[PDB]
Amino acid sequence: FGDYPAEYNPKVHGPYDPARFYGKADVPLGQVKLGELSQWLGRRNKNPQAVAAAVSRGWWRWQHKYVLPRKGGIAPYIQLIVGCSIFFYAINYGKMVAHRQRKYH
Amino acid sequence: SLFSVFDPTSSFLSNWLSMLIPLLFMVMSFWLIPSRPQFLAKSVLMGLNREMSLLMGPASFGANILVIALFLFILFNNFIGLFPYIFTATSHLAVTLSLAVPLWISFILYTWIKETTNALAHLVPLGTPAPLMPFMVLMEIISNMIRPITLSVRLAANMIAGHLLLTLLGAQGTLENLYVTSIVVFSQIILLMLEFSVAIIQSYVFMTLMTLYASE
Amino acid sequence: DIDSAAKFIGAGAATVGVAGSGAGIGSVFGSLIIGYARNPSLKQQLFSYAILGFALSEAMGLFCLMMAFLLLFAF
Amino acid sequence: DIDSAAKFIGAGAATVGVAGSGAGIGSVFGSLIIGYARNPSLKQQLFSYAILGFALSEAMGLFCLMMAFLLLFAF
Amino acid sequence: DIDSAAKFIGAGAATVGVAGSGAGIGSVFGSLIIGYARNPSLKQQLFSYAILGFALSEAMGLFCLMMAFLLLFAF
Amino acid sequence: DIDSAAKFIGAGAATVGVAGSGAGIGSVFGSLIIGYARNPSLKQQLFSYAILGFALSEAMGLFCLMMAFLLLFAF
Amino acid sequence: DIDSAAKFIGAGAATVGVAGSGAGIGSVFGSLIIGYARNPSLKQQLFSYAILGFALSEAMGLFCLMMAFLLLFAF
Amino acid sequence: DIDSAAKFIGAGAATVGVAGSGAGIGSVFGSLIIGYARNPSLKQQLFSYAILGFALSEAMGLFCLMMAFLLLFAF
Amino acid sequence: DIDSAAKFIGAGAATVGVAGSGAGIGSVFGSLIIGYARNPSLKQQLFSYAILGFALSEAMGLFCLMMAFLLLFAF
Amino acid sequence: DIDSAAKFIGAGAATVGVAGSGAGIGSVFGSLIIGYARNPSLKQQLFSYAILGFALSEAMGLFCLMMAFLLLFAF
Amino acid sequence: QMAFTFAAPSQVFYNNANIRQVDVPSFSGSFGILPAHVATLAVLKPGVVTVYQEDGSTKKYFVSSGTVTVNDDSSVQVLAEEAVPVENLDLQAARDILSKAQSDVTSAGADMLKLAEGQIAVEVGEALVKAAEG
Amino acid sequence: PVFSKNAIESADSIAAYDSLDSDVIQSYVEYSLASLIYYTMKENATSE
Amino acid sequence: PRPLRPVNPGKVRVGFVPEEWFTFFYNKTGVTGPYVLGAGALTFLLSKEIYVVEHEFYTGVAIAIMGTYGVKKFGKQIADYADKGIGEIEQSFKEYQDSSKI
Amino acid sequence: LATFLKYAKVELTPPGPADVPKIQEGIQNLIHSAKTGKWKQVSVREAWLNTLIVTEIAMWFFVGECIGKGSVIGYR
Amino acid sequence: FAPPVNVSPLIRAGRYGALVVGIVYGSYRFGSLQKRENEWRVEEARRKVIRDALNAENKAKATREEMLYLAKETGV
């Protein structure tokens, strides 16, 4: 279902930037000092709607970095092809391992 | 194991995720002036929409987008499926049958319900003799009946043969002998250019045939 | 095992039927060459029917290729 | 058990008839390219003749394909 | 046992001959498309020849499919 | 016991040579259509060759069907 | 009697070669119709070439028929 | 024995399907000669469409050779 | 005994292959008729091209016949 | 020596693919005749395209002959 | 909706008239012309031109020889030397012309010029008889 | 302007004109020259 | 703040790998740090046969060669065609604004 | 590619013989970071990287195992 | 690119230490598994001989029975 998230305020946040998280300013996982990493993990909710929101925000960050600029290249499409081929190899891990060339390795 | 490309029973996360691939490769529009891939995708879609509007007619308002979405679905599964470890959904006869049968039913049943006597006059191709008229009726019935089989087979069997011919060349590509490897890679470059062209041609064939069946 | 041996011979004999599709595709694209060289103002539109001429003939030959799997992985 | 085996051989040899339907379809639509190159305003009736002619030729191929499900099951 | 099996083989090998009838029908109707594109005022007389071609082309198929069933049962 | 099997398979294989006769008949009547569209004044001469062509497009074909009886009952 | 058995089967396969003669004669006399329709002022000279095409095309099929006799009453 | 032996017959009978590739390639490049002689100024675009027809004919013939190699080795 | 039978069968199946040579010879000589009709001032160069085309097609047909005789006698 | 016997039948069945090379060569040089008749001021490029078409069609015929020898002696 | 110009030294028949279809008897075979037909040129033969006017009326004109020019803008310019209506023809004079033409062919002997004249007059006589009967 | 057979066969637009052999173009320029000379003769006679 | 549209996308080394991955290691492992990490990773996958060289590895190689040749041959033409279209659209919008003012 | 060879000479060379007392003072500092702290005060970006670096050392170990065993694909 | 950076001496020492350990571990494991592969080949040679003899006898008898059954079907 399509609607802006409830934290979005068009009279405060300006135009809608879907890659931006409009909620309360939580510490990003990059700069967490790892002594509070369990507290950071417990602070973020594990709801499937929040997970799909974080996936969509990340996918829009990638769109904003590699596709949405005007003179974008074919680097995003090669990234998708390689990312899909690696993921589909990890899915078929057994189907490729069961046809190895060497025994011991 | 040769046919191991066509084994969707892969892991707990199965190979049916090959149908969510077109959601990744569809252009998302944010800015008012489009980017290069959005403009290129829209230009190709507008070109095919203009080509199909000639065959559609004015009484087919829904056929502008219903065949374009089918073209992009078939094209993305045929094109991004040829990359190595990616599962090809349209290789299986189930997906192509799932695309061809419902729209063919939506043509045949709606034509019979809407215009019955016009369809019965349309069975005779305007000039054939009356002794050959029941034969032409049987020919028209059979030719309409094997319409969705000849779409699903022409897509699935072509994709299966197109990837089995690559797998046969890959299995003979030994790594110890560099000469055989270079021959295999060069022949697979020729074969993969042929397979990419066949993939786009077969998606355009399906769009053209669905447009012709929608209009007629 | 006469059944599997005659299934191989049956699939091999049925695979001849794609030769007609190959000849039909060649005649379609040959007459596309002629039609484009005679009236190059309709280069797209002739090509569209030429693509249509690639479709239905191939739908006959690959039908024989369907039996080339049917006698093996279905029967 | 030679009976079922020879049914498989007969079905495989019966599937060769779809090639000629594929070649006839190729000749029809290739000639549609040539005919449309000289009189595009007639194309609708020209298209109708193709939809007549292909509907006969493919039907002959389907008759052989019908023998692939008539010499295989009913006989 | 072997006679009925070889009757199935001979009937399958006889059913190839409808391919030539399918190709002849395609050539007749293709050239009807070509001929009508030159003189559309002859759209009956050309069509009479096209029907005459079909009335002989499928007759060859009506020999071969007959030579299936006559070989399958009568002979 | 296998001579009957040989006659059945040989007649079934010999009944493919009329496919080429069917394709020749289709080509003759197709080109009769085109040659009448181009030059309709000499119609009674075009038919005067086309039927002759049709006879020579079938005299060979019936010879193959002649073998489909000579292998079957005469030898 | 497997030797005479495959003599019959090999002869039946060798009689498929008459099909190519049938299609070749049909294409020769088809093009004779068109070539007479375009330039009917040299018709008998065109007719002589048609005989020469017949004098080759049937001959090729007759050679396949000859091989049937070589598989029946010579080897 | 029997299953291993009949794979040779299946592969050899599937080899016939590249005849349609040979005929389609010949028809495409022959009509490219006709298209070039008609309109030599478009020889860069005529050759591009003839390569497509050659590729699709090659695709059908290689599919038949794929099935031949499949029956010969992959089983 | 079985080996001589299979040599008979392979020789028949190889002698099938002169059919396409007969069709190519028919296309060459018919197209010579058409080309001489559209341009009777070049009847010597076209006949040379017809001789070259017929020689190459009959070379392919004699290659099939050579393979037939090799499988019948040499191996 | 049943497996060797089936190799000989498979080779005889695999040698029919040269028929498609024979028909493609006939189409190429027949259309070379028509093309040189229409436009005799470009015969070097016409002969270049005829050589390319003859080489590709003969390559498909030799591919069929290569498969007819690969399953005969090598495998 | 095809601009069909049909003129002659004697008369002018149509001048940019909109015509549905014209059946031209040419030296490359009798072919029909529709809107946007093809950009070909043609050389007329003794024969009958059939003109399909926009109201559906069909008219016929015997043409001896001329030039046919179908252009890219669907414009046709048939320009015969002596184009007449087919209704203004004499069948008896046509048969006399054909008989005299065959007499000149027989009496030509080794005269190749008079042989060509007799052949041409034979063609005109045949076309005139077929147009008058038609 | 009056053009010969070779000046017409070598033109850029003549490749767009169908069904053109040497005999058709030769016959066409012969009659087109005759028609143009007739049209100029009529206009010259009226002007004189 | 208002989102901005940069002219050029993010920097990419070796066709598809992001440049931020390579500059992440510059505090510790220099410039050949990431490259030898990828080299050791590929060698370890091919060593313990976690990545099995199957019939699809040569398909991936042939795709990589074809993709590099096609992109290097047609990337300038396709980018020029796309930027021509975007310029035409932006020109039409600017012409609309000027015409409305006039 | 010459600059890559230059960087390989600068960076892929064995350490200096005189820094052995220094690195032990570093190694015992890691022991001082293995008992007291200096790791629960590590940003996950930095921690990510420190792990990443180490994986590189282990991959150099497997490269050396490939060198010792000869061929790359398995133990032949 | 950027100016080159000298790696940390601990990183270089651990990396080349892991390289040396990898070389000696690869040599030791290859020498260990070579004897195991030789012993496996020694027992597999006898297993291959026994399997080949039994399978060839079974294949020959099954081929004889199959040819007799097919001759019965064909009547020759």
Residue numbers in the entry:
A (entry chain R): 2 to 106
B (entry chain N): 4 to 219
C (entry chain 8), D (entry chain 7), E (entry chain 6), F (entry chain 5), G (entry chain 4), H (entry chain 1), ...: 1 to 75
K (entry chain H): 15 to 148
L (entry chain G): 173 to 220
M (entry chain K): 1 to 102
N (entry chain S): 26 to 101
O (entry chain T): 3 to 78
Sentences from the paper on this structure:
ATP synthase is a unique molecular engine that uses the rotation of its subunits to perform the catalytic reaction of ATP synthesis and hydrolysis. Unlike in mammals, mitochondria of the crustacean Artemia franciscana have the ability to accumulate large amounts of Ca2+ without undergoing the mPT. Here, we performed structural and functional analysis of A. franciscana ATP synthase to study the molecular mechanism of mPTP inhibition in this organism. We found that the channel formed by the A. franciscana ATP synthase dwells predominantly in its inactive state and is insensitive to Ca2+, in contrast to porcine heart ATP synthase.
Thus, we determined the structure of A. franciscana ATP synthase at pH 8.0 to study if IF1 binding to ATP synthase is also pH-dependent in brine shrimp. A. franciscana mitochondria were solubilized with the non-ionic detergent DDM, followed by ATP synthase purification at pH 8.0. We then obtained maps for states 1, 2, and 3a, among which state 2 was the most prevalent under these conditions. The state 2 map was used for further analysis to generate the F1, FO, and Peripheral Stalk (PS) local refined maps with nominal resolutions of 2.64 Å, 3.39 Å, and 4.01 Å, respectively. The overall structure and subunit composition of A. franciscana ATP synthase at pH 8.0 is similar to the one obtained at pH 7.0. The main difference  is the lack of IF1 in pH 8.0 structure in all rotation states, confirming the pH-dependent binding of IF1 to A. franciscana ATP synthase. In the maps of A. franciscana ATP synthase (state 2, pH 8.0), each non-catalytic nucleotide-binding site in α-subunits is occupied by an ATP molecule with an accompanying Mg2+ ion. The nucleotide-binding sites in the βDP and βE subunits are empty in all the maps. Therefore, the βDP and βE subunits are found in an open conformation in all identified rotational states, while the βTP subunit is in the closed conformation. We find that the overall structure of ATP synthase is more stable at pH 7.0 compared with 8.0.
